[PDB]
Amino acid sequence: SGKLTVITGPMYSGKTTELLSFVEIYKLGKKKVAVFKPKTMIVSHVEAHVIERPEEMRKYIEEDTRGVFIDEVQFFNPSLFEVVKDLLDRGIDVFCAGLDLTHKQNPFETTALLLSLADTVIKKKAVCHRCGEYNATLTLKVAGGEEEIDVGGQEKYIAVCRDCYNTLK
Amino acid sequence: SGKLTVITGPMYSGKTTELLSFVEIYKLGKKKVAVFKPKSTMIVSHVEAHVIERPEEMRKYIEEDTRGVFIDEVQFFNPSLFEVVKDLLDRGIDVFCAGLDLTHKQNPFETTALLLSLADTVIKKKAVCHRCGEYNATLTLKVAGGEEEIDVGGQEKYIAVCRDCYNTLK
Amino acid sequence: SGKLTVITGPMYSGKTTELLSFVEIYKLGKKKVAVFKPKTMIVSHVEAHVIERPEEMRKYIEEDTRGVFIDEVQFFNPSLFEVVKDLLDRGIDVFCAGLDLTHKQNPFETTALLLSLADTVIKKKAVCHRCGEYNATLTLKVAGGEEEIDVGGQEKYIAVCRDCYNTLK
Amino acid sequence: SGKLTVITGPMYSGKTTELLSFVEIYKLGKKKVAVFKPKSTMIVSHVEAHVIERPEEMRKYIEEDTRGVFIDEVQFFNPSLFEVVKDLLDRGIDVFCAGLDLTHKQNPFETTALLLSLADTVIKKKAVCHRCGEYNATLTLKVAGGEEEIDVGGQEKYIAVCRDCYNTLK
Ligand SMILES: Nc1ncnc2c1ncn2[C@@H]1O[C@H](COP(=O)(O)OP(=O)(O)NP(=O)(O)O)[C@@H](O)[C@H]1O
Ligand SMILES: Nc1ncnc2c1ncn2[C@@H]1O[C@H](COP(=O)(O)OP(=O)(O)NP(=O)(O)O)[C@@H](O)[C@H]1O
Ligand SMILES: Nc1ncnc2c1ncn2[C@@H]1O[C@H](COP(=O)(O)OP(=O)(O)O)[C@@H](O)[C@H]1O
Ligand SMILES: Nc1ncnc2c1ncn2[C@@H]1O[C@H](COP(=O)(O)OP(=O)(O)O)[C@@H](O)[C@H]1O
Ligand SMILES: Cc1cn([C@H]2C[C@H](O)[C@@H](COP(=O)(O)O)O2)c(=O)[nH]c1=O
Ligand SMILES: Cc1cn([C@H]2C[C@H](O)[C@@H](COP(=O)(O)O)O2)c(=O)[nH]c1=O
Ligand SMILES: Cc1cn([C@H]2C[C@H](O)[C@@H](CO)O2)c(=O)[nH]c1=O
Ligand SMILES: Cc1cn([C@H]2C[C@H](O)[C@@H](CO)O2)c(=O)[nH]c1=O
Ligand SMILES: [Mg+2]
Ligand SMILES: [Mg+2]
Ligand SMILES: [Mg+2]
Ligand SMILES: [Mg+2]
Ligand SMILES: [Zn+2]
Ligand SMILES: [Zn+2]
Ligand SMILES: [Zn+2]
Ligand SMILES: [Zn+2]
């Protein structure tokens, strides 16, 4: 059967970098891959199919696809759980990267569902913006409104450890 | 801050055994622990626990010098457990939670899913597949009783299987 | 091919307990195992063949042996490296537990050689006898002479973290 | 105390890439680092380093506020590296070492073996097997040049293989 590996953690924790490392491993082994991002390059702080609904993946999966790679999974509809389950049942390995928690420390539900299904969970850490320790597990929003769905980078979000998050809040 | 470690996997994967290992570690270090299970008193694998109905009941048993909180069968607790645990971590208390990730129908257990999202560390445990004997079982399959997803029981009702064996047997 | 897993760390770090957990996994799967200790029970703080030389293992390995489990590997002749390599080549998984360092912080050479060969290395920690933190990586000798080969338990050896070791020395 | 992390595996397993990742982590935290390679200056994967012949030469480049020491290609350093590293750990400096565990003939590299024994954490990396394409290569096989076990080189001389493929090709 296919195995599901979920790579999660706060922003800047190396989730996309790890995901791309896995893509490279499959490519080096001459295994066909399909790479997806929500609505073209997967960029760290490769080319992907940009899709809206998880079900669109099926358009781009071939008989000999061995691995499916999905970035920013927190932005996908939770139906991604059942789509992934079906890929695993068909012998296709799946690798997902995404945020575990919003900047308000609420779960991203799609990520949470995938963590449930995962054969392996890799929790990544970032360097804390405040204290410089390699212990950041949260993201804090420093600009924009309070919205939990709000695309952005270092102008809007910083990685912090739990103590620094509580101090700053 | 406290760290949250979530130990998950199918039945018979050693989740409770691992949880009790960490209890032992804290006890050897003369660190105060609080141990909980959902509503008898014995946390026993295939230690004494406070048997509680609701996550909000944990506060009564958490003293000022509690260093670790240990919770088994977390799939059966109300999802309010998420904010309770977050508060403990903010106060510097380490939390260890053991529970099933998936029902026998491969639906997520909500509370476990939420705690996986808050976790600093996730330990996915495997079991031996009842069918092929490999150490690759990640799922539980229900072999007796009804189709119900909430149904307490052991070997008389559930086996651990790998994905391929689960699909084959279904 | 067989895979080699080495479980190492100071005394009281759970190495035998982990080794026995692996034995149980193979037994539950109805896979034949062969279990060895140096010169009858493997006891944590199962029955084993007590042997002197690593080459004696071959007397007790059968065509359908799937796993070989060796405790206290630090006490075996370094020829255990080549014996293990041959088992792996034959498709037999090998699990070794043993101390990485003496109480003088010198390497146990047999363990070191096996760490080199290992597919997976599990470093176990103990609770520090002095500070109570789960950070003990060393063993300190508190009775007996200075000998590095000296069988014993808690009457002779304690597990300590590096800072506590240096403080106590 | 400082902790020692040893990153090992066959060629092309990402050892240097992982080592440089940890360098980056310390640099982002504004922690002083010292980076070494055996005797040009660039540590480059398949950052600037001090190129040194002997482990005893590291002391010159370690300042009072050095937080991390990073060492690549440790298999080529004298086994005296063991006591040098032990001393750094005793002084509170974290050490990260990357190196091969085994020669192409499957003999242990002595210095790597000693550091594996001192390590707090061992990361075994794999490569893609040149023969079967699976992510299961743990060995290096020499495909050109002589039988020598000390022979600097890359893809023109060495491939990564799994155990079964190594045995088959031999
Ligand atoms: N606070 C930080 N900690 C660690 N690395 C950082 C930090 N800020 C920037 N970086 C850089 O970010 C890289 C990781 O980038 P990447 O793999 O894109 O992370 P990510 O987890 O995908 N982030 P995101 O997509 O925003 O949720 C690191 O290798 C660093 O170069
Ligand atoms: N300092 C300590 N830290 C952790 N556990 C300890 C300590 N002292 C005693 N124990 C107990 O020891 C058990 C681990 O025993 P075991 O699996 O035999 O360890 P080991 O690493 O094999 N020791 P050794 O064979 O002496 O090299 C733990 O589960 C505890 O019950
Ligand atoms: N299929 C199986 N795989 C592994 N262990 C099993 C299996 N069936 C029974 N066991 C026994 O169950 C123990 C694990 O029990 P436990 O820690 O209570 O697991 P969990 O809390 O995950 O159900 C094992 O050590 C073993 O003795
Ligand atoms: N057989 C292989 N397996 C994996 N990666 C390989 C292989 N051959 C070449 N590469 C490339 O080598 C990179 C790893 O290089 P590097 O970090 O310098 O490894 P090491 O220091 O272990 O030799 C991979 O990311 C990949 O780009
Ligand atoms: C798989 C599964 C288990 N259970 C119960 C059976 C056990 O009482 C408990 C799991 O025990 P365990 O994870 O310690 O082995 O959960 C359900 O109620 N529904 C399910 O779908
Ligand atoms: C496998 C092997 C590599 N080497 C050299 C080749 C490379 O120069 C270096 C390993 O590089 P790497 O581990 O960064 O890929 O070691 C030997 O000298 N002897 C050997 O047996
Ligand atoms: C932390 C956080 C990030 N994001 C976005 C910012 C980035 O575009 C992406 C993480 O790479 O997710 C949110 O939309 N909500 C959040 O709460
Ligand atoms: C730490 C240490 C333990 N031992 C012995 C004590 C125990 O009998 C065994 C570890 O379980 O190894 C030594 O012989 N030398 C040492 O340096
Ligand atoms: Mg990203
Ligand atoms: Mg249990
Ligand atoms: Mg032992
Ligand atoms: Mg390299
Ligand atoms: Zn911080
Ligand atoms: Zn099976
Ligand atoms: Zn200590
Ligand atoms: Zn191969």
CATH number of the domain residue C75 falls in: 3.40.50.300
Residue C150 beta carbon below 6 angstroms from any ligand 8 atom: yes
Cα–Cα distance measured from residue B38 to residue A135, given in angstroms and rounded to the nearest whole number? 32
Q: Are B69 and B147 within one domain?
A: no
Is C72 one of the annotated active-site residues of the chain? yes
**Best A15, A22, A127 residue to mutate vs chain D (most D CBs within 10 Å):** A127
Cα–Cα distance measured from residue B137 to residue B15, given in angstroms and rounded to the nearest whole number? 13
Enumerate the residues of chain D whose CB falls inside 8 A of the CB of residue A30. 133
**Residue C120: what residue type?**
T
Give the residue from A107, A124, A141 where a domain finishes: A124
Tally Cβ neighbours within 10 Å of residue B149. Answer: 12
Q: Which atom of ligand 6 is nearest to the CA of D13?
A: 15
Q: HSE (CB half, 13 Å, CA atoms) of A141?
A: 15
Taking every pair of Cα atoms in chain C, the longest distance, rounded to a whole number of angstroms, is: 52
> Parallel, antiparallel, or unpaired for β C4-9 and C120-123?
parallel
Q: Are A135 and A114 within one domain?
A: no
Residue B13 beta carbon below 6 angstroms from any ligand 3 atom: yes
Q: HSE (CB half, 13 Å, CA atoms) of C12?
A: 24
Reference D140, options D11, D46, D8; nearest CA is: D11
Q: Are A57 and A119 within one domain?
A: yes
Domain of D59 in residue numbering reads as 1-125
For chain B, give the secondary structure using H, E and C.
CCCEEEEEECCCCCHHHHHHHHHHHHHHCCCEEEEEEECCCECCCCCECEEECCHHHHHHHCCCCEEEEEECCHHHCCCCHHHHHHHHHHCCCEEEEEEECECCCCCECHHHHHHHHHCCEEEECCECCCCCCCCCECEEEECCCCCCCCCCCCCCCEEEECHHHHHHHC
Q: Are C34 and C61 within one domain?
A: yes
Q: Are D49 and D98 within one domain?
A: yes
What's the CATH number where D156 sits?
A: 3.30.60.20
Report which bound ligand comes closest to the CA of C130: 15
Write the DSSP assignment of chain D as a string of letters.
---EEEEEESTTSSHHHHHHHHHHHHHHTT-EEEEEEE---B-----B-EEESSGGGGGGG--TTEEEEEE--GGGS-TTHHHHHHHHHHTT-EEEEEEESB-TTSPBPHHHHHHHHH-SEEEE--B--TTT--S-B-EEEE-SS-S-S----STTTEEEE-HHHHHHH-
**Structural element, H or E, at residue C153:** none
Long-range contact pairs involving B47-53 (C-beta distance under 8 Å, separation at least 24):
B47/B20, B47/B23
Tally Cβ neighbours within 10 Å of residue D25. Answer: 20
Q: Which chains touch A (3 or more CB pairs under 8 A)?
A: B, D
**Best D117, D164, D165 residue to mutate vs chain C (most C CBs within 10 Å):** D117
Task: Name the residue of C6, C13, C41 whose CB sits within 8 Å of the most ligand 2 atoms, as the mutation to test its pocket.
Answer: C13
Reference C129, options C158, C167, C166, C165; nearest CA is: C158
Q: Are B115 and B141 within one domain?
A: no
> Parallel, antiparallel, or unpaired for β D139-142 and D158-161?
antiparallel
Enumerate the residues of chain C whose CB falls inside 8 A of the CB of residue D5. none
Residues 6+ away with beta carbon under 8 Å from B53: B38, B39
B46 is in an annotated binding site: yes
**Structural element, H or E, at residue A115:** helix A109-117
Enumerate the residues of chain B whose CB falls inside 8 A of the CB of residue A112. 108, 113-114, 116-117
Residues 6+ away with beta carbon under 8 Å from A141: A103, A150, A156, A157
Reference D7, options D98, D138, D105; nearest CA is: D98
The answer to whether the CB atoms of B128 and C31 lie below 8 A apart is no
Task: Using a CB–CB cutoff of 8 Å, tell me whether B101 touches chain A.
Answer: yes
The answer to whether the CB atoms of C14 and B21 lie below 8 A apart is yes
D51 is in an annotated binding site: no
Q: Are D165 and D151 within one domain?
A: yes
Q: Are A61 and A87 within one domain?
A: yes
Selecting from D106, D114, D163 the residue whose C-beta is nearest the C-beta of C112 gives D114
Measure CA of the first residue to CA of the last residue in chain B; give whole Å.
45
As for how many domains chain C has, the answer is 2
Q: Are B101 and B141 within one domain?
A: no
Tally Cβ neighbours within 10 Å of residue C152. Answer: 12
Placement of tokens 């499957």 in the chain: D106
Residue C149 beta carbon below 6 angstroms from any ligand 8 atom: yes
- Measured CA to CA in angstroms, residue D88 lies from A94, D27, D64, D66, D116 at distances of 42, 19, 11, 10, 16
Q: Are D78 and D146 within one domain?
A: no
A144 is in an annotated binding site: no
Q: Are C28 and C88 within one domain?
A: yes
Selecting from A85, A115, A162 the residue whose C-beta is nearest the C-beta of B117 gives A115
B/e letters for B11-42, b = 16+ CB within 10 Å, e = fewer, are: bbbbbbebbbebbebbeebebebbbbbbeeee
Resolution of the structure in the document, Å: 1.5
Task: Using a CB–CB cutoff of 8 Å, tell me whether C163 touches chain D.
Answer: yes
Task: Using a CB–CB cutoff of 8 Å, tell me whether C130 touches chain D.
Answer: no
Task: Using a CB–CB cutoff of 8 Å, tell me whether D92 touches chain A.
Answer: no
Placement of tokens 């912090």 in the chain: A160
Our answer on whether C and A touch (3+ beta-carbon pairs < 8 Å) is: no
Placement of tokens 């759970």 in the chain: C14
Q: How far is the CA of C70 from the centre of ligand 2 (A)?
A: 17
Cα–Cα distance measured from residue D109 to residue D101, given in angstroms and rounded to the nearest whole number? 6
The answer to whether the CB atoms of A134 and D30 lie below 8 A apart is no
Q: Are C88 and C25 within one domain?
A: yes
Reference A156, options A3, A36, A16, A45; nearest CA is: A45
Question: In which order are the strands placed within the sheet that holds D32-38?
Answer: D50-52, D32-38, D66-71, D94-100, D4-9, D121-124
Task: Classify residue C95 by its DSSP letter.
Answer: E
Cα–Cα distance measured from residue B139 to residue A84, given in angstroms and rounded to the nearest whole number? 15
Task: Name the residue of D46, D97, D152 whose CB sits within 8 Å of the most ligand 4 atoms, as the mutation to test its pocket.
Answer: D46
